[PDB]
């Protein structure tokens, strides 16, 4: 809520004081908080703040995931076909979710 208020309201000294009061909790909840912009609903850019688990972040840095990410990036920006770009990005997302689930069995 504090992040949403600070980003949506750029100029407010009261919110600034609240931020200088809660900077510690903001720093703690920074690795867990995401930020994503979509076209979803209406015709404007929104923000989709959500939660990231510790396990998802600690399994993203596995060597298999890094190799798969490198291969996907190379194969999707080399040839591209820039609608299959988004299609294969979603497919790579699903495959990497499956690989994180598999790597959870450690």
């Amino acid at each position: 809520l504090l992040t949403n208020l600070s980003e949506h309201m750029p100029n407010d000294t009261r919110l600034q004081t609240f931020l200088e009061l809660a900077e510690s909790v903001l720093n703690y909840f920074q690795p867990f908080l995401g930020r994503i912009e979509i076209m979803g609903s209406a015709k404007r850019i929104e923000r989709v703040y959500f939660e990231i688990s510790e396990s998802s972040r600690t399994q993203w840095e596995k060597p298999q995931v890094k190799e798969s990410k490198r291969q996907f990036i190379f194969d999707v920006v080399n040839e591209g076909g820039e609608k299959e770009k988004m299609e294969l990005f979603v497919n790579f997302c699903e495959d990497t979710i499956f690989e994180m689930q598999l790597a959870a069995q450690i």
Binding site: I38, M39, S41, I45, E46, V77, F89
Partner: protein
């Protein structure tokens, strides 16, 4: 298979050294350069074969006394009489020597077939060696260079262009540390991954408006919720521009 066969004869372990080529990237690029231009290379080798065959036919018909590859003259003569021996001689020694088939054939001095022999020699050397060997070498080298250039272009596009949202570098860089912060926090990749995983994990009843909309679009496999050249800084222009 090779490791098992190594116990039969303890020399098949030499083939395991080629595993170093599946390690470092530049070795893989060098190996893939051979097959990157495959059809053109095979067809050029075929053209080399047919032109060497034409030269073989001409030499077989006209200049046969010159092919006396004997050990200093008066020995049991080892000539090239039949078609197959001449063809193997031309494809084995002719295409390799630095100057053509003239570096091994006896010197044509005094014979009536002197100008014809000289033309044969020069045309062979020039055409087959220069043009075809240089063309094959250039094919392989240009394949290697093209692959390296493609990799460099991929890296440059990743370092100067927004992967999603497709804007570029000169737009976000108007503020200090703009593009790096944009890629790190705003339009990230692992963030989109974690958001998809979060949508899959959560129940359908607890989805908010945006989450339910994104879930519906993803279920229908209809991707317009991704940015298509617009961002927060463009639509919601800071303090409304």
């Amino acid at each position: 298979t090779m490791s098992v066969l190594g116990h039969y004869n303890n020399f098949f372990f030499a083939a395991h050294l080629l595993d170093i080529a599946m390690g470092f990237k530049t070795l893989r690029t060098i190996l893939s350069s051979v097959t990157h231009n495959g059809k053109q290379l095979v067809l050029t080798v075929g053209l080399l074969a047919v032109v060497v065959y034409l030269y073989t036919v001409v030499a077989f018909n006209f200049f046969r006394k010159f092919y006396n590859k004997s050990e200093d003259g008066d020995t049991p003569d080892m000539k090239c009489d039949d078609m197959l021996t001449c063809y193997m001689f031309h494809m084995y020694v002719g295409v390799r020597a630095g100057g053509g088939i003239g570096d091994e054939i006896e010197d044509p001095a005094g014979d009536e077939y002197e100008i014809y022999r000289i033309i044969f020699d020069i045309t062979f050397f020039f055409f087959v060696i220069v043009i075809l060997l240089a063309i094959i070498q250039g094919l392989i080298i240009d394949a290697f260079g093209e692959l390296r250039d493609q990799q460099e272009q991929v890296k440059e596009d990743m370092e100067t262009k927004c992967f999603i949202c497709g804007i570029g570098n000169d737009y976000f860089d108007t503020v200090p540390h703009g593009f790096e912060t944009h890629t790190l926090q705003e339009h990230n990749l692992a963030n989109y991954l974690f958001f998809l995983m979060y949508l899959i994990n959560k129940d359908e009843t607890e989805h908010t408006g945006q989450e339910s909309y994104v879930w519906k679009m993803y279920q229908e496999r209809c991707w317009e919720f991704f940015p298509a050249g617009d961002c927060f800084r463009k639509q919601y222009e800071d303090q409304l521009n």
